[PDB]
């Protein structure tokens, strides 16, 4: 998941688009509205079945709180496309 | 903008642009019911005139809005990258 020579600066953006639970690019990104943290749907829903809190900041969170953060899905798709188009 | 080598990055630029002011998000707010995003001031001003999402027309009021803090970080990071890749 690396860029052509001289695009090391892209790492910051790549890192922002990765879930803190699984380290993969957001898959069906969900926001926790009370704290603005984001996770893959499956990742966060699995965590909340365990503990009803944000796995980053510890604020109380229940499953009905979660909302889709659709723009992150769009960004993941577009960044993957960009990266592959450049490596070509 | 991006040099020709990196023209594809315009796709990422486009996703970080507020649909009200056409500038990169400043203090991004998400409308949770529809997942569209706008600069905080842009959408709050719009809602004082018409209580709807500018893109999808669902009813929205100011108490609905939540910070989408990841977008501000993405804007900051992409600005850095762009400003250091002008001669790529
Ligand atoms: Zn995940
Ligand atoms: Zn949190
Ligand atoms: Zn705006
Ligand atoms: Zn909308």
UniProtKB/Swiss-Prot annotation, chain B:
Protein's cellular compartments: Nucleus; Cytoplasm, Cytoskeleton, Microtubule organizing center, Centrosome
Source taxon at top rank: Eukaryota
Similarity annotation: Belongs to the RAD18 family.
ZnF locations on chain (RING-type): 18-57
Lineage: Eukaryota, Metazoa, Chordata, Craniata, Vertebrata
Subunit and partners: Homodimer. Interacts with UBE2A and UBE2B, one homodimer binding one molecule of UBE2B. Interacts with SHPRH. Interacts with HLTF. Interacts with SPRTN; leading to enhance chromatin association of RAD18 and RAD18-mediated PCNA ubiquitination and translesion DNA synthesis. Interacts (via C-terminus and phosphorylated form) with SLF1 (via BRCT domains); this interaction is required for efficient repair of UV-induced DNA damage. Interacts with SLF2. Interacts with SMC5; this interaction is increased in a SLF1 or SLF2-dependent manner. Interacts with DNA damage up-regulated protein DDUP.
Protein name (Swiss-Prot/TrEMBL): E3 ubiquitin-protein ligase RAD18
Function: E3 ubiquitin-protein ligase involved in postreplication repair of UV-damaged DNA. Postreplication repair functions in gap-filling of a daughter strand on replication of damaged DNA. Associates to the E2 ubiquitin conjugating enzyme UBE2B to form the UBE2B-RAD18 ubiquitin ligase complex involved in mono-ubiquitination of DNA-associated PCNA on 'Lys-164'. Has ssDNA binding activity.
Species in which this protein is naturally found: Homo sapiens (Human)
Residue numbers of the full-length protein present here: 8 to 95 of 495
